[model samples]
Target: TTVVDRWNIHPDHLWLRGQRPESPVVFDETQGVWNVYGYPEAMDILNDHDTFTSDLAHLLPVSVDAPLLEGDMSQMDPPRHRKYRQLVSRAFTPRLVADMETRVADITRELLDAVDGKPEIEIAADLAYPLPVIVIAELLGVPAGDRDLFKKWADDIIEGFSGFSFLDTSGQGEQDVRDATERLRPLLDYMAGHVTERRRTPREDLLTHLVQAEVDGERLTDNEIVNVANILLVTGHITTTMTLGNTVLCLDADPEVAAKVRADRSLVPGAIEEALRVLSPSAALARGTSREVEVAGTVIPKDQIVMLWLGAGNRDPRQFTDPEVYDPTRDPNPHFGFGRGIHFCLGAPLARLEGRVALNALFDRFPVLRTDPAKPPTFFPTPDMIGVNTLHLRTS
Candidate 1:
């Protein structure tokens, strides 16, 4: 069990606090949904698109409806989904991600240099937040200096998303829908502007590449481009930001292992992996059941929503030995830290690279790093997320 006291971790994930669910699959009457907590069970649902479709337009509250929803790639399924994935794959080349390594290292160094003389620094604000945002903003051809504006937009958006009722319960969930609508407006405007501008003006960037990509003789529209870019701009950086701070939190909890990681640079990768498994940024990933299906002996009816709780799945005693322990040495660390199957995170590689660099630089720069007991870390308020919103470190 994790030893940290009063972490303010969202209690929505009881598994995170070392309380294993009685059963892997259960129907929560209050939420009116099926929760798949077992690793294998969650994998079964994710692997089969025929039984479980990603599209939930018919099921979701009307608040999610928009012209942009037409281009939301994650919600698309089957033949159509294949086409979009292939088309975008052409633009998001492995070479494109690999090319960012030098830039990531340089940015890491630059950000750390700012906090160099200080005895204490807030990891999320000073380093974790800006590094990935700047890298992606530059790669997407947006002005990197506009990061603070992006942060405002992201804060509003995540807050709006966190408001999402696991199932709309009375007065609260409905308002979140309206709030989400309002929160997304500024982001939509910014992305729409960039999409149209890029269409007219040729530029060398990921956004331009996405707009120009064509397959099956089909051209992308401004709405489609904006949809993908909005996802890229927000998820690409915010998740990576979570990746950075959450890994550090693990070190704080297990200092002996932290010392092992600090002394042996090779252990850095495993540290990141274990943190991803134990403190997954994505606490739960959602999927819609297109038809009736049996998962772990429970027959979930057709047209149901299933929440594959990644945090729970990663800690399933059936999957990991000493599931509560933060051991990263498993040979086949088949953790659902990244969603499994067809919808596996598209940004996983880049996020991993950022984790490696950010954590490496953090260890190199601050051999004496420790959390400040006077000013404790605060976690993301959203249950669907896991990370520190504010992390103060004494680097002396």
Candidate 2:
């Protein structure tokens, strides 16, 4: 199938309506990309890292001169990937995330305070965006004064990666890709400078931790460190932001679910998990085949790019009972919201922490929160994400 309609996978639009491929796997002849739509196949590809590669440069089309990310752990396969992931995983442990809870709560309350008396609230701008940005910025030891600038750079870099479907494919897309690569030069340079400083004067922050991290008597090079820093800065907050937006919209869409969560704070975590499954912030990620591989009766040629549709996989009827329903109380919810296997999100704990704290604070401050019927939420038209760009809420 051509698979030109991207919105068919959107949760509210056509999710679970059988818009996705009926088969476990299908080849998108138009894009020459394999669409792994089944739950098991998706997990297999994600978990079996050796057979399928995550080096994005091989999967995504980039100009020869574009400043591509090198040594970023997400884009690397194991042994190397394991080494880099372990170096910084210590900082994102449950204990560290737990310590940040109070600060995250304070940040949430501060955001709520700003929109407290206002009848109309823009959740995306007021709470969702700033909360994660501040949390990640502080974690990375970004100077208070430079955070705003840092956020701008991060946004541009992410934007360049996002909206792949909207790219102008007639050479314009390639040029845009080149331009996007150029855009990251400043952000990359900024991170490089920070890493250099951290090397000279090691402070107590993630950057310092990364600089001094030693695994198997090997340390990360400057290039690797800078790329890792950029990954942390960009992915650290963006995923959480997407999750926050989706969670808010989910609750607003279903008051019963919201009431269940608000009545029992313990259910907040379940709600977050459900949100991740229902509308995963990361809609799709690319993986390249190392050799001709057969998955669910489909043969994907070697070195070919396969797009794992996490949004579709999460709702696979074979994986969950009543997959269409957004039930927070779902037991055995082994969803790919944080992904699976070696490259699973390192910041999953932190994202969950922020999601829980932010939601709890919002419900506490504005128990009567509801969507603005007049001004509905707007979504980004990108296949890569499933969340709101601007969501309006009525807070009382």
Candidate 3:
């Protein structure tokens, strides 16, 4: 009953097959990449950014110098990362995020109720995908862009990630990298236009807030604003989609757990955490060795691309008692689902809140969710990620 073939999970993700890593840190000679599988090993790398850095454009297959990528926090080092992170950190505060609970539930209710009396619902299409995009739209202070236009652009970027497998040893798919930046041009321009508009006519949205602080010679540059808004607008959907989608899949598959979760709705947040641990959607991220550093006794030389396996680390035996089993009661679930430390996800609260609110409303509406046998779930083709792109469910 493994999810390896059941949900079309990639075979490259060995951890999903209920297999254990022989050691904490191992190098894949085939890909010329280092893999981190242990929990502590991942934390060590996550906490100490100087030794292992997210700012590794030089190690990229193609050296990308796009202005659209300028103020990306995920690609910048500490001091600079801190400065830019503060700009949006104020937007995602706990209280501010908590305030969106009713609106999140309202969006979820509308989507689900719209599917009422229909034969079946493609959860991904109806609820999972649009939920965050709409919420993020209002949050970004953007009810301006063509809804489908934004979806198409964002979908293109996600589709682009599939071709970027680190299959090559020296240089990753050159064309894939180039194609990615080329595709981003439309999205970048759209963001630029929105930012320019926000500057001229300020509004009560993230875009306007970001474009503020016009101290003439001070504040974020237009490109910087685009980078932040662009990245947020692009990323805002996928996280919630992944978390919420995986959660629905997990609970539906495990009926007993689903029943328990349904019984005690208070456990919804914990269930989301466990679901992410069991099947992390954004399973891996790329990091480069800052210098010759020994991680978990393995000496990874400088300038090497390290694939941080957060999914594998989340289920490490050293971290969890029974790493494979789904247990919502498992406290201190320090899974890197939203990541950890300075580069910790700014959308953490939003992702969690949406998951809880949406799941509860979903359960409250449907008594039983039947995975349509003829139409099984399809995971994304990208090796670095574990998430369903399409999920069909019918009420039983």
Q: Which stretches of candidate 1 lie over 4 Å from their true place?
A: 1-8, 61-70, 144-204
| CA error at residue 259 for candidate 3, angstroms | 1.0
TM value for model 3: 0.86
Judging by lDDT, tell me the better candidate of 1 and 3.
1
In order, candidate lDDTs are 0.76, 0.75, 0.75
lDDT of 3 at 360: 87
> What lDDT is reached at residue 219 by model 3?
69
Q: Local error of candidate 3 at 51, Å?
A: 0.3
Residue 157's C-alpha lDDT in candidate 3? 55
Query: Cα deviation in Å at residue 382, candidate 1?
Result: 1.8
Which candidate leads the pack in lDDT? 1
Best first by lDDT, ranked: 1, 3, 2
Least well predicted 10-residue stretch by lDDT in candidate 3: 161-170
